[PDB]
Design a protein around this ligand. Sequence first.
Ligand SMILES: [Zn+2]
Length: 359
Amino acid sequence: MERLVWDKLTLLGFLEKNHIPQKLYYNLSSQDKELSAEIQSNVTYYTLRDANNTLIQALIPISQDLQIHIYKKGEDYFLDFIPIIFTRKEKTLLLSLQTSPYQDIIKATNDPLLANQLMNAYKKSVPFKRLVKNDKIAIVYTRDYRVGQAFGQPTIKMAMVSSRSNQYYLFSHSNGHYYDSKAQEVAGFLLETPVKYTRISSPFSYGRFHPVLKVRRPHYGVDYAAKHGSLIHSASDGRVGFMGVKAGYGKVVEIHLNELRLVYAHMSAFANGLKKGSFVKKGQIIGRVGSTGPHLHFGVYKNSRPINPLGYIRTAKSKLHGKQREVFLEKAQRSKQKLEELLKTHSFEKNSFYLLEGF
Ligand SMILES: [Zn+2]
């Protein structure tokens, strides 16, 4: 296949460019239309053409784990939503700073997304502006590969940053939140429900891809059933990055807050004065619920990846308890011992970074 980057196109633009009847999109269920509206610019996608230059296959990412597969059989085009095929590798970075964190992490890994994720995750506990030469940074993380090419975002499993005689740890959890050495949440956020709802008509789901009888489509936000006219509130502070129509979402507002993007779709109207560029405060009215039943699709992206918004709708951060805490801390202990060992057996006099396989 040709490997290409997406840039300006929408799904309907891509179909027209390639003489694929647009009914391939319009016949989709509304849920599939919603999935189709999150083709991000800058994503690597893949195409196969015949000796007449006719589009025979395209694989276009919707998320890190799901893609649109367009393909031609005989005279007909088909469109499925299917798993992205990939390999997952775990790495451990041991770094002694020589200049600047962002810059040195990139020099050691070629992975600016990793650098930026770490900076954001620590921004309220160790500002990177604070770090100096010979401070230490460790990161255990996974990276995904398709046919030898890295794609998507890394995921941090653990990190340790040392500054001013202290070590500051970050540990992932299966619940999606990150925690410090005390099993207290770090680098999260507090969201408000964006609409007064009757029920959640469709919850968030990562989907299920095997075995065949268990297969379930992902849904990368929360669909709220709400009475016609309901006002929509921003779940957070932020800045409006998009306001308008996107096929599959109808009228939609997107708000950016640091590494977050919040999506508010199927609206009837935007709030007077609101435009691209506006700053908004948590709870501020941004528009009104539409049927473009009446529903709001609320999406939350963290480091460009959809996450279950309901885990963040709360008035205080997460802190583990009970057996969850016992198990978390025992795992954290063993992680800490292993990192200490790796740091023993890896002198920074020889090399100012090491990039190791596994952990
Ligand atoms: Zn939805």
